[PDB]
Amino acid sequence: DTTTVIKGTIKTIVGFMIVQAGSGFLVANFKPIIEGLSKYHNLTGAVIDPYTSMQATIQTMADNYAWVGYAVILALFLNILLVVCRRITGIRTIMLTGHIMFQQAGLVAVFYMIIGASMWETVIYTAVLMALYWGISSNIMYKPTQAVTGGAGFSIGHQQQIASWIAVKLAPKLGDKIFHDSISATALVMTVFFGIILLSKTHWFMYIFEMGLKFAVAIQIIVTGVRMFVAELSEAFKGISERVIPNSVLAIDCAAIYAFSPNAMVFGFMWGAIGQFVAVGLLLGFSSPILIIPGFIPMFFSNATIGVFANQFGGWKSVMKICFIMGIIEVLGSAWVIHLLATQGTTFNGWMGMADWALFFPPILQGIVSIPGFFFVLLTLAIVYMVFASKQLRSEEAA
Amino acid sequence: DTTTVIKGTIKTIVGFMIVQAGSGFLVANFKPIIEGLSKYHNLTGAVIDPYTSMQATIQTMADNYAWVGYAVILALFLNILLVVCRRITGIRTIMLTGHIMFQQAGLVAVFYMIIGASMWETVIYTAVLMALYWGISSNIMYKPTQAVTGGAGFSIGHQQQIASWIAVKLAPKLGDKIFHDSISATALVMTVFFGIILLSKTHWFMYIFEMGLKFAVAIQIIVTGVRMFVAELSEAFKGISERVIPNSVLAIDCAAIYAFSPNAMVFGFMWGAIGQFVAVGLLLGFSSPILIIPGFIPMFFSNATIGVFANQFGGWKSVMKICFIMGIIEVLGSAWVIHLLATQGTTFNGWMGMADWALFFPPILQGIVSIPGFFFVLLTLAIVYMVFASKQLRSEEAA
Ligand SMILES: O=C1O[C@H]([C@@H](O)CO)C(O)=C1O
Ligand SMILES: O=C1O[C@H]([C@@H](O)CO)C(O)=C1O
Ligand SMILES: [Ca+2]
Ligand SMILES: [Ca+2]
Numbered sequence: 001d002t003t004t005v006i007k008g009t010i011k012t013i014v015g016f017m018i019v020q021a022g023s024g025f026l027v028a029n030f031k032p033i034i035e036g037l038s039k040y041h042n043l044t045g046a047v048i049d050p051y052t053s054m055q056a057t058i059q060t061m062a063d064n065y066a067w068v069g070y071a072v073i074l075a076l077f078l079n080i081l082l083v084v085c086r087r088i089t090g091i092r093t094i095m096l097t098g099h100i101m102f103q104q105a106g107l108v109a110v111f112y113m114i115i116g117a118s119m120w121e122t123v124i125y126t127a128v129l130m131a132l133y134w135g136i137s138s139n140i141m142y143k144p145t146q147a148v149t150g151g152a153g154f155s156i157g158h159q160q161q162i163a164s165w166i167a168v169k170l171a172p173k174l175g176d177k178i179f180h181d182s183i184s185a186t187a188l189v190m191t192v193f194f195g196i197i198l199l200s201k202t203h204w205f206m207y208i209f210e211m212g213l214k215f216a217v218a219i220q221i222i223v224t225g226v227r228m229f230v231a232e233l234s235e236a237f238k239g240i241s242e243r244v245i246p247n248s249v250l251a252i253d254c255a256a257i258y259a260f261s262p263n264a265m266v267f268g269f270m271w272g273a274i275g276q277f278v279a280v281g282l283l284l285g286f287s288s289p290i291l292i293i294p295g296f297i298p299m300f301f302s303n304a305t306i307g308v309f310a311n312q313f314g315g316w317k318s319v320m321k322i323c324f325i326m327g328i329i330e331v332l333g334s335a336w337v338i339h340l341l342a343t344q345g346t347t348f349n350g351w352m353g354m355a356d357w358a359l360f361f362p363p364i365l366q367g368i369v370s371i372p373g374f375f376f377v378l379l380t381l382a383i384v385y386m387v388f389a390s391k392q393l394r395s396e397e398a399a
Numbered sequence: 400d401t402t403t404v405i406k407g408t409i410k411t412i413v414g415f416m417i418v419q420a421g422s423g424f425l426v427a428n429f430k431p432i433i434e435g436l437s438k439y440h441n442l443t444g445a446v447i448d449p450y451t452s453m454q455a456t457i458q459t460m461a462d463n464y465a466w467v468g469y470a471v472i473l474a475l476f477l478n479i480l481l482v483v484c485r486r487i488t489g490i491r492t493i494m495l496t497g498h499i500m501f502q503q504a505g506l507v508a509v510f511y512m513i514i515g516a517s518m519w520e521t522v523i524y525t526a527v528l529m530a531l532y533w534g535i536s537s538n539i540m541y542k543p544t545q546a547v548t549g550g551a552g553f554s555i556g557h558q559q560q561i562a563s564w565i566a567v568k569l570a571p572k573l574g575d576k577i578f579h580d581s582i583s584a585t586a587l588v589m590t591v592f593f594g595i596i597l598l599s600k601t602h603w604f605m606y607i608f609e610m611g612l613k614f615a616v617a618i619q620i621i622v623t624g625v626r627m628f629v630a631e632l633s634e635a636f637k638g639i640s641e642r643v644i645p646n647s648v649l650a651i652d653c654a655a656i657y658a659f660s661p662n663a664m665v666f667g668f669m670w671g672a673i674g675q676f677v678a679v680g681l682l683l684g685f686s687s688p689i690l691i692i693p694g695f696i697p698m699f700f701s702n703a704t705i706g707v708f709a710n711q712f713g714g715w716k717s718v719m720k721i722c723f724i725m726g727i728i729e730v731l732g733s734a735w736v737i738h739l740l741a742t743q744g745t746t747f748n749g750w751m752g753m754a755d756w757a758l759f760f761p762p763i764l765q766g767i768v769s770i771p772g773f774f775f776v777l778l779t780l781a782i783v784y785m786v787f788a789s790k791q792l793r794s795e796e797a798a
Contacts, residue, residue, distance in 0.1 A: 008536075010579075010583075010612070011579060011662035013609075014579065014582060014613060014616055015433050017612060017613055017616045018616055018620070020424070021420060021421065021424035021616060021617065021620060022420065024423055024424055024427060025416075025419070025422075025423055025424065028423055119434075179627075180409075180410065180413070183413055184409075209775060210412075213409070213413055213416060214411060216413075217413055217416045217417055218420065221417070221420055221620070350677060
C-alpha cells in the first residue's frame with residue numbers, strides 16, 4: 001500500500017487546513033461581536049453547534065490538539081477491547097464515525113485541559129470515558145434501534161444515545177402507537193435567533209441575513225474540512241474493525257434511521273426548536289451572564305432522533321413533551337457547561353449542544369470538578385452495567 | 400420565476416463570501432512572505448495564476464468590484480449586438496464562460512482603476528475591450544477549432560485565442576503531419592518552484608510542502624467560490640443568448656478540445672513548464688526587480704491549448720517551439736505588467752499569466768499608458784477587421 005497511506009496523510013492535512021481557513025473566516029467576522037459584547041453588557045455569547053465547538057476546541061487546544069487524535073485512537077482501541085471481550089463485558093457495538101469521535105473526544109480533552117490536567121491524564125481519562133460512553137451508549141441503544149429499524153442489525157452511534165434511552169424508557173408512559181441546504185438552514189436559524197434578540201429598517205435586517213450567511217458559510221467550510229480531515233482515518237478505523245471483530249455491531253450515524261420514520265422528523269425537530277426557543281427566552285429573561293445562540297444541527301438531528309424514538313415508543317405526545325424538555329435541557333445545560341468552563345479558567349465560546357452533551361456530560365464534568373475520584377466512581381458504574389450486560393448476553397445467546 | 404431570482408442572488412452572495420474566505424486565508428497565510436521579501440532583497444513577489452490575480456483584484460478594488468460586474472454585463476450586451484449584426488460585422492462567436500468574463504474584465508477594470516480613471520471610463524473602456532477581444536478573438540479561432548474538433552460546431556472562448564492564432568499561422572512552417580487533483584498539481588508546482596528558489600533539511604522541505612498545500616487550499620476555496628458566484632449570473636447570460644441569438648456559435652472552454660488531442664496535453668504543458676522554468680531562471684539570473692511564482696492553471700491550460708492547435712497545424716516540433724516561447728513570454732510578459740502596474744502607483748502581487756495576458760495585453764496596457772488615443776486606435780483596428788470580416792461572411796453564405 002505505502003503510497004495510498006501518503007495520499008491519506010496529505011489529504012487529511014489538507015482537511016485540517018480547510019478547517020483552519022473556515023476558522024479564520026469565522027473569527028475575522030465575529031470576534032468584535034463577542035468582544036463587542038464586552039463593551040456592552042454581560043459578556044458571552046456562545047453558539048450551540050458541534051463544528052463551532054470543534055473550532056473553539058482547536059483554537060484553545062493549539063498544537064496540543066494532537067491529544068484528541070491520541071485519545072481517539074486509544075479510545076477506539078479500548079472499544080475494540082470491549083467488543084473482543086463481549087462475553088464478560090456484554091458490549092457488542094463499536095463506534096466508527098470519525099467526526100463524531102473527534103468532536104466528542106475533542107470537547108472532553110479540552111475540558112480536561114481547561115481544568116489543567118497533564119497530557120497523559122487527559123489522554124487516558126478521555127480514552128476511558130469516551131470508550132465507555134460509546135460502547136455502553138450504543139450497546140444500550142441496540143435493542144430499541146432494532147425496534148425502530150425492524151431488526152436491521154445496527155445500533156445508533158451519535159450524540160443522544162442516553163437521551164434517546166430516556167425517551168425509550170419514558171415514552172411508553174405518555175403515548176399510544178450539502179452546500180445550500182445546510183447554509184440556508186443554519187443561516188435561517190441565525191436570522192431567526194437574531195430576530196428574537198430584536199425582541200429584547202431593511203438595512204439592519206439585511207445585515208442580519210448577511211451575518212447569518214457569513215456565519216453559515218464559515219460553518220460549512222468547517223464542515224467539509226472536518227469531513228475530509230477524518231474521512232481516511234475513519235476509513236482505516238473500518239479497516240481494522242473489519243478484521244479484528246468481523247461479526248461486530250456497527251454504531252453508525254443517527255440519520256441512518258430517519259428513513260425508518262420520516263414523520264417524526266419535522267415535528268420532533270420542530271418541538272425541539274420550540275424547546276430551545278423557550279429556553280433562550282428564559283436565558284434572556286433572567287439576565288443570565290451567558291447568552292446561547294442555538295444551531296440547526298443539534299435541534300434537527302438531536303431532537304429529531306429523540307422524536308423518532310419518542311414517536312415509536314410514545315407517539316406525537318411523547319415527541320412533543322419529551323422533545324420539548326430535551327431542547328430546554330440542551331440550551332440550559334450548554335450554558336451551564338460554559339459557566340463551568342469560564343470558572344475553570346478559560347474562555348470557551350462553543351459547545352456541542354446535543355442531547356447527551358447538555359444533559360449527561362454536564363453532571364460528569366461537574367463530577368470531575370468536585371472530586372478526582374468521581375472518575376473511578378464512573379468506572380464502578382461501568383462495571384455495574386458491564387457485569388449485568390454480560391449476564392444478559394450469556395442468557396441471550398444460550399437461551 | 401421571482402423566487403428562483405432571490406434564490407440565485409443568495410447563491411451568488413454565498414459564493415462571494417466563500418471567495419472572501421479563501422482570500423482571507425490566502426493573504427493571511429502569505430503576507431509575511433512578501434513582507435519578508437521587503438525586509439531582505441527586491442520586493443515582489445508575484446503569482447502567475449488567474450484566481451490569485453482575481454483575489455488581488457478584489458483586494459485592490461474593495462467595494463468597487465461591482466464595476467467589474469457592470470463591465471461584464473455591458474460587454475455581454477455589446478457582444479450580443481455584434482452577433483445580432485453578424486452580417487455587417489462578421490462576428491459569429493459569443494463568449495458565455497462567465498468566470499473567464501469576470502476574470503478578464505476584472506483585470507482590465509483594475510488596470511483602468513490603478514491608472515486612476517473614473518467609474519464610467521473604466522466600465523466603458525473595459526466593456527469595449529472585453530467585447531472586442533471576446534468577439535474578435537473567439538471569431539478568429541472558429542475555423543481552426545472546426546479543423547481540430549472535426550467540425551464539432553463550436554469555437555474557443557478562453558485566455559489564449561490570439562496566441563492560438565499566432566500558433567495556427569506559425570505552425571505549418573515548423574512540422575510535418577478537481578479537489579486534490581488541482582491541490583496536488585498546484586502543490587507540486589509550488590514545491591518545485593520553491594526547490595528552484597533553493598537553487599540560489601527535512602523541516603525546510605516539509606514546510607515547503609506545507610506552504611504549498613496552504614496556498615493550494617486557499618486557491619481551491621477561491622476556485623469553488625468563483626464558480627458558485629458566477630454560475631447563476633452566467634446561466635442568466637446563457638438564458639438571454641438562448642432567445643436573442645439561438646443560431647449563434649458558442650465560444651466554450653478550451654479544455655473541451657483536449658479530448659480531440661489527449662497527446663498534446665502533457666507535452667505542450669511539458670515544454671510550457673520548461674519555458675516557465677527558463678524565464679523564471681532568467682528573472683533570477685538578471686536580478687529582476689520582480690520575482691515570479693508560476694501557477695499550474697496557466698502552464699497546463701494555456702500551453703495545453705497552444706499545444707493542441709500547434710500540434711494540429713505543426714506537429715510536436717511546433718508544439719515544442721511555440722509552447723516553450725509561449726511560456727517564456729508568459730513569465731516575462733506578466734512580470735512586465737507587474738512592473739508597469741508598479742510604476743503606475745500601486746502594488747499587484749499576481750497576474751493572469753495566461754498566454755494572451757502576457758503577450759497581447761502587456762502592449763495594450765503600455766500603449767494606453769503612453770497615449771489614451773491608442774485605445775481609439777484599437778477601435779479603428781476592429782473596423783479593419785469587422786468591415787473585411789463582414790464581406791467574408793457574405794462570401795461564405797451565398798458563396
Ligand atoms: O453531530 C453531528 O451530526 C451531523 C451528522 O453526523 C449527522 O448525520 C454532523 O456533521 C455532526 O457533527
Ligand atoms: O482560466 C481558467 O482556466 C481554467 C479552466 O477554465 C480551463 O478549463 C480555470 O478554472 C480558469 O479559471
Ligand atoms: Ca484509502
Ligand atoms: Ca440553476
